[PDB]
Coordinates of C-alpha atoms and ligand atoms in Angstrom, one line a residue:
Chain M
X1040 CA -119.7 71.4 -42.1
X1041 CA -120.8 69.9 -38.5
X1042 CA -119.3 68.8 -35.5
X1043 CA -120.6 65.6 -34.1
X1044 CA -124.1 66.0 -33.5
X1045 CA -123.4 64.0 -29.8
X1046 CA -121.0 67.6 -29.3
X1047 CA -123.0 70.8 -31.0
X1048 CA -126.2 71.7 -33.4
X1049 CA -124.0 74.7 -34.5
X1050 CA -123.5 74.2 -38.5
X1051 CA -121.4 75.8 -41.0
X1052 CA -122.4 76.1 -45.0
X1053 CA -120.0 76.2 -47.9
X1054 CA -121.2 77.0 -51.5
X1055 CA -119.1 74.9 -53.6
X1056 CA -117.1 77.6 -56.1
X1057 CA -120.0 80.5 -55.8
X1058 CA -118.8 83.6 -54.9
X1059 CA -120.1 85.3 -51.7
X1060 CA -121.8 88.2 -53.5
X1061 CA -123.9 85.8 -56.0
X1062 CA -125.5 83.4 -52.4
X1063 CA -121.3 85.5 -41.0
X1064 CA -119.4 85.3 -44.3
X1065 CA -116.5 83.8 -45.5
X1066 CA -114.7 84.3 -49.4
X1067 CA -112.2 81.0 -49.6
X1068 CA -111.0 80.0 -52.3
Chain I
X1351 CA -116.9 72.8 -67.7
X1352 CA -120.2 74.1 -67.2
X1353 CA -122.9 71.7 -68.0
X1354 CA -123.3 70.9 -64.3
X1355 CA -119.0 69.8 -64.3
X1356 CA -117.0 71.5 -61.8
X1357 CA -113.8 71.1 -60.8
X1358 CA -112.7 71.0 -57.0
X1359 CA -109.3 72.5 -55.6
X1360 CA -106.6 69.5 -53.7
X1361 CA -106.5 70.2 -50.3
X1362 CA -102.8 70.9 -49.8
X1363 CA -102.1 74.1 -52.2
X1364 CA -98.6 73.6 -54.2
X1365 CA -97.3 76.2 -51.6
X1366 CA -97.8 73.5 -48.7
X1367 CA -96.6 70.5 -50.8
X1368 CA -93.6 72.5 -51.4
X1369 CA -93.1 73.1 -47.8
X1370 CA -93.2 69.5 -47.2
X1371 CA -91.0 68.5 -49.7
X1372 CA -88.3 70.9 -48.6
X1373 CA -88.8 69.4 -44.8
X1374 CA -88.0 65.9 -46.1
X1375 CA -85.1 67.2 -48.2
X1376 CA -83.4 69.2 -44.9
X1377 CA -84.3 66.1 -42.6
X1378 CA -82.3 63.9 -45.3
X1379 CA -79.3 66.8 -45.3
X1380 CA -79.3 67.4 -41.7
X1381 CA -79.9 64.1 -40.0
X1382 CA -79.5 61.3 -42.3
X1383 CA -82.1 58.5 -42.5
X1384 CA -82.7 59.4 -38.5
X1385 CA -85.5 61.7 -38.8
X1386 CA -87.9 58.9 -40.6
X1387 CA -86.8 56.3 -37.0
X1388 CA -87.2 58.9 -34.6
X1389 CA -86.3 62.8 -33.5
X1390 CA -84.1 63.9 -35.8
Ligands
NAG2637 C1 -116.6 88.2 -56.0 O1 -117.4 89.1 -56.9 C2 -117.2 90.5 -56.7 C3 -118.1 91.3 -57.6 O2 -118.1 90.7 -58.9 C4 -115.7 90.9 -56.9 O3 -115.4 92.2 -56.5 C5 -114.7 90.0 -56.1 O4 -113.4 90.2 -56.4 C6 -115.1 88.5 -56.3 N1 -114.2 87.6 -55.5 C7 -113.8 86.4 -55.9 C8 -112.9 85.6 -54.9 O5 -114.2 85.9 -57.0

């Protein structure tokens, strides 16, 4: 998950259904 | 559904397509077909 790469280098990761315990963190659904 | 499938949840939860549903239907009570023109 970026913003533009012209407005930050800060990046965000999302594993796709994988629980947070099995990989700042973040359960979603 | 786990030889590499997977499936992926919609965007809008059936909450939040529930709430939009019921802001159409008390547009189309309360202001007629104004709301879909302009302010309601
Ligand atoms: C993630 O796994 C842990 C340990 O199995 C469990 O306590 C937790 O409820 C799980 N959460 C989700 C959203 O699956």
């Amino acid at each position: 998950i970026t913003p533009g790469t012209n407005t930050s280098n800060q990046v965000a990761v999302l594993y796709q259904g994988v629980n947070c315990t099995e990989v700042n963190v973040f359960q979603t659904r | 559904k786990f030889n590499g499938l997977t499936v992926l949840p919609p965007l809008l939860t059936d909450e939040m397509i529930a709430q939009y549903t019921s802001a159409l239907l008390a547009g189309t009570i309360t202001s007629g077909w104004t709301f879909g023109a302009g302010a309601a």
